């Protein structure tokens, strides 16, 4: 086989396209299914106006036959008789009519066709089947495409073994030496168990309907390699030559390409979880001390791991976030050495933390304890820094992680990755931690269902946006946009305000919590703030655009604002200016994704009505927009940051990486025991939890 | 006009079709689109051998003339200079050209077609389009599919006025009095604003590109009714006709249907939402009890209300608990006074208590605190008792909330809802609670963002499945499967089980949480207890299958069970028997929906391991599976049971409502501040919350 | 024949001459893929199966012209020596005219051309067929004026 990746179909030269007999022919059964035929014309008339050598092998002339013999039949009665097939004649006929329409689609693109119609003993005279090859060697030569199909009129051979019009497509593209053989039949594909059932799974790849499947790996030995696909699906062959992916792709990778390759690792870490979870009384702590000394260690291979690595990847010079971000310095281990170790002790009791303590009955003592989620996900740009950070969070919270990064930044990845599994290894005994980077096929991963549980987009806002365009199915974390907003009210001081605003975007305008608006009550204007605020602008180049009820407001002005929801990432902040708090107010919730906000005052009363009707994130008075970091807020090492309003808010840190159960020790008590028959009373005192 | 709902369609007798010169051919030009052609016309010849009347108004034949007559030209130069299109000429060969093709596709059905060529003049002369009408009416009534164009080769009008292949399609569709005008462009619809901006939305319905709308409104007065639909979208016409949502709609009947429609309604609750925020202490625990009383002062509005819709819907007799839990008494509404008045006096620290409370540095003081999600939006059955019950957990969580069931019980669900709005509207200042029921096209409301928060289904597990398969880009609450199950251990005393699986079944089968599974020791197999359970579920007669490891090991035995993740939901359950604890724990979250679990034995050795290891989402102790109700838990009135592993564990009680948020209250406070040039230091004390 | 067979009689064509059609399309197809360069100074088989299609194709548009409807046998030279083989094609051959569908004969010249009673060409082949099914009169339109 020459192609083993559905991404090396793009050079296929020759194909071989078969046409299911439930392709052609409607389910009524009142004339062909022009759309599809006429689509399956185009997208072959495209695909040979292009070089390749494409060469159809149609079915189905006995269904169309069939109909049109009924209908001759229904219109050749006495009239008398309509007041109250045999399958070589059918055949006839639908093999006529099929090459006529065949014949008109295709002179519609300038193509020409032949049909070649062979039998089941023109495969055993050695001399007929090399003049056959030889004939569809020579016509295809031509640029003319061929149409074989059985010669079903005088000997059908339903009555490698050739016993329909898949064998023979089979042995056919085998002989030609194709490339590619593709079955459009009607199903979707090939499922594990048949579609009426649980478990009726779509396999996008056969690693080495019984028919198909069994011609299928026959014509595989020869080279051919087949992709059987759903007919009744648009645009199907142009998808399939274009690399998507489309049906079930048969293939030998297996050992090939690699033996890890996704689901049980999921498994193996979530059995991973369910071991780590017997790992909580300083022994989790041990893990990431033992980590602790290991990334202390073992400088020289973790070094150039990231050195030879950094050094093929910086020829490339893709962009400069990457190109800036992706070296490595034991100088920045010292600084990954000191955080997981303080990591190591403040997650003493992450798991097992009683919440509720209420007793019902008698000896029925029911309570409510943490667990930890099982199997995250997440992922991340080529920054080999985050992962052994985030990781001592797993490490820390019990629960089954997986990672994803880029080609970029490889080699430090699969050796902090031997670094961490050997520390699981060490103490955790099984790896309940696995990289499985180099192209998963993203969705193919978030496609999974039941195995793991929530999405953490790491990499950068470009790569979280790609998540929640593409997320669905599973939970998702993680900030979208960071359109933070700041307000200064009409008897607020200008210097605050101005070191503040000098602050919040002066700091690291490449944070995603970095402000990117600004607002001032409109008596302020003539307080001889504007010209202040600019001028701090200028005194760090800051691009400044203005908003409707400042453009009209200033006559030389700064320029225009294409959109108040828009965002910059770099030295540039928009400008608008509002009289009403309660417009501000309305701006921010009209405008504002709701990350982070603050005030800046020194009038209470607005003060407190400002931040408790506000519903941002996180509020703040008197400080910047550029404390959305976790560590800052005295709470730990966060994992990012959360724009939804379900189960996180703002800065997710251990907690947001938990869950709960309940649980319930109970003597002999039923549910109808407490009706009034059985001597139950439901007290509900609330002790207080140790 | 004869139609204003899309359900209406399906009887549309005389239809027009247009095709925009962009269906017809391809983009790169080289060719039709024979895919898109053959789907339209395959559309139209089985919407016409069933009955209807189409009449196409062709575009597009100068593209297809200009392919023509760029081949022919570049095939007419000398030899020497290839080695270094008026719109009349190509219009006629297009012309011709495309009524072969035509021709040739519909001829593949039995269908005949007939060309007729107007001009802008020729709708001038009076006689003359008279005699036009009476020459397309006397074709029409022939079952000849006419084909109207413009006569674009000898007087092409592009140089109500007549000014395309558009305003043609409108005039003609309104003289002939058609039902209803497909207008099939190449965009998907209409957007608010151009596709390329933020708003972008598709209206779905066109309430009373230039072009296309100028014509469709002019038609739109005449009694035809017009639908822009995308030409590019696989089964267009058969989906349009067949009522789904697709392309825009223009109609009249805002003013017909109703002034309440979708949007406003979340956003004025979100408001009232602001608004209800401001009711705190003891107001909305007013709000609650100004209901109380006004459902104990107006029984005989709503008995009445529900009575006659109870009666209504008796003669319907859809099914057993529709029929059976749609009634209303003031028994019930007893039962309802008594709840609510208890969830009057609980929730009044539910909104606005302190999480967390630690100092940065001085004058530094954050914090976290509760906060209301929002706009709701619960999904419920005909059931009239829990919509005011649920409600009550509403205004005690000062949030805003949505409300849709069905048709049937409606009476007393507007009655209830102005009992409600009512009470919103003597406290409360604003309603932000809105019934908006009647087919609201539930995905409409759950396709909105922004808007509504969470979705939680409470009709029954059928409805709360439709929403699962249908429920995307919004979170969503509320169980799906309730598989439980049950273990009991080679110590455990038999009586207990007997009861235990007793009372956890035959309580309540119909419960989402009722047991479906029962497993025991192997061991136990030889401790008679197998006829003692046997002899309990005759007593109840419970259909029993059984599993793999019981169906060998006994003889005679029970019958076979389908599939163990089966469930019933009436009076079955199957039994399985495992020897290993750990097959057992492998047996529930390999099966197990982890939505209850419990156990019962005599060593604790087992119940600990048992207990901490598995991982549903409660579990129990020598106790019935028929403890989850929240209210039995002595938590409160809960709102669903969560089977996910985000935010919500089994009772979602009045917390699983709110949500968190953070505020800092610095004085002069800055981030790069905490530099080491900045005298800031982070002192990171939790003081004790108040 | 579309007349001579709207009027109750029985026809059944023989047509020969897919070949020199295949001849002549093939040559088309060639001369119009050489490089620039060589234009500046045809196996039976495959000129056989394109002659064959078009022609099928042609036959088809002529004879729905009249509402007519046809259908193509393609035979050998095996074909006529299995006894089940040849009851068989006569069985479909008789159920195709009961039906009032012209058909067409011709050998498969495609993959097996016979030139390489004895059927020979498509002459001995009208005979033989028309001397199976029994028919009244047989038609040779050949180029000559008749026999001198």
Chains 1, 2 share one sequence.
Request: charged share 20%; glycine share 6%.
């Amino acid at each position: 086989p020459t192609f083993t990746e559905r991404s090396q179909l793009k050079y296929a030269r020759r194909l071989v396209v078969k046409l299911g007999s439930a392709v052609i022919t409607r389910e009524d059964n009142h004339g062909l299914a022009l759309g599809r035929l006429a689509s399956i014309v185009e997208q072959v008339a495209e695909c040979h106006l292009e070089g390749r050598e494409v060469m159809m092998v149609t079915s189905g002339a006995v269904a169309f036959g069939k109909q049109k013999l009924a209908q001759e039949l229904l219109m050749s009665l006495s009239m008398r008789e309509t007041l109250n097939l045999e399958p070589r004649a059918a055949a006839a006929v639908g093999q006529s009519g099929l090459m006529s329409l065949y014949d008109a689609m295709f002179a519609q693109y300038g193509v020409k066709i032949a049909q070649v119609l062979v039998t089941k003993p023109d495969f055993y005279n050695e001399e007929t089947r090399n003049n056959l090859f030889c004939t569809l060697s020579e016509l295809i030569s031509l640029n003319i495409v061929p149409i074989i199909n059985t010669n079903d009129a005088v000997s059908p051979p339903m009555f490698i073994p050739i016993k329909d019009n898949d064998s023979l497509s089979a042995m056919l593209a085998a002989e030609v030496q194709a490339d590619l053989l593709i079955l459009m039949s009607d199903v979707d594909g090939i499922y594990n168990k048949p579609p009426w059932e649980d478990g009726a799974k779509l396999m996008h790849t056969y690693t080495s309907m019984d028919s198909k499947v069994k011609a299928a790996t026959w014509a595989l030995d020869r080279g051919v390699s087949v992709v059987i696909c759903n007919g009744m699906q648009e645009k199907a062959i142009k998808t399939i030559i274009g690399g998507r992916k489309v049906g079930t792709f048969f293939t030998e990778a297996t050992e090939s390409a690699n033996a890890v390759p996704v689901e049980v690792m999921a498994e193996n870490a979530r059995t991973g979880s369910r071991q780590m979870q017997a790992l909580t009384p300083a022994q989790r702590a041990s893990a990431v001390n033992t980590l602790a000394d290991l990334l202390v260690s073992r400088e020289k291979f973790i070094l150039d791991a990231n050195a030879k690595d950094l050094a093929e990847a910086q020829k490339s010079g893709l962009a400069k976030p990457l190109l800036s971000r992706l070296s490595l310095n034991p100088a920045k281990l010292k600084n990954l050495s000191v955080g997981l170790k303080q990591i190591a002790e403040d997650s003493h009791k992450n798991v097992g933390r009683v919440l509720r303590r209420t007793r019902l009955a008698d000896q029925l003592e029911l309570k409510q304890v943490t667990v930890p989620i099982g199997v995250l996900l997440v992922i991340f740009e080529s920054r080999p820094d985050s992962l052994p950070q985030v990781a001592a969070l797993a490490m820390a919270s019990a629960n089954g992680l997986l990672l994803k990064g880029g080609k970029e930044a490889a080699h430090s990845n699969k050796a902090l990755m031997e670094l961490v599994k050997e520390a699981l290894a060490t103490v955790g005994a099984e790896h309940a931690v696995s990289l499985v980077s180099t192209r998963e096929e993203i969705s193919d991963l978030l496609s999974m269902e039941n195995h793991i549980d929530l999405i953490i987009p790491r990499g950068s806002s470009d790569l979280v946006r790609s998540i929640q365009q593409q997320s669905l199915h599973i939970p998702v974390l993680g900030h979208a946009e960071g359109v933070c907003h700041v307000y200064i009210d009409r008897d607020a001081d200008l210097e605050k305000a101005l070191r503040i605003a000098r602050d919040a975007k002066c700091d690291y305008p490449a944070a995603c919590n970095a402000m990117e608006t600004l607002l001032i009550h409109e008596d302020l204007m003539s307080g001889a703030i504007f010209g202040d605020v600019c001028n701090m602008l200028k005194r760090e180049g800051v691009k400044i655009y203005a908003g409707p009820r400042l453009n009209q407001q200033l006559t030389f002005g700064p320029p225009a604002a294409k959109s108040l929801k828009h965002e910059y990432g770099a030295l540039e902040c928009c400008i608008e200016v509002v009289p009403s708090l309660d417009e501000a107010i309305n701006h921010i919730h009209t405008y504002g994704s709701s990350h982070t906000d603050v005030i800046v005052t020194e009038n209470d009363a607005a003060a407190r009505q400002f931040l408790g009707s506000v519903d941002s994130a996180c509020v703040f008075h008197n400080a910047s927009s550029r404390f959305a970091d976790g560590f800052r807020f005295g709470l730990g090492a966060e994992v990012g940051i959360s724009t939804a309003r379900i189960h996180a808010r703002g800065p997710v840190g251990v907690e947001g990486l938990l869950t709960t159960k309940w649980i319930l020790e109970g003597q002999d008590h039923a549910a109808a025991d407490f009706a009034e028959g059985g001597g139950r009373t439901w007290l509900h005192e609330t002790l207080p939890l140790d």
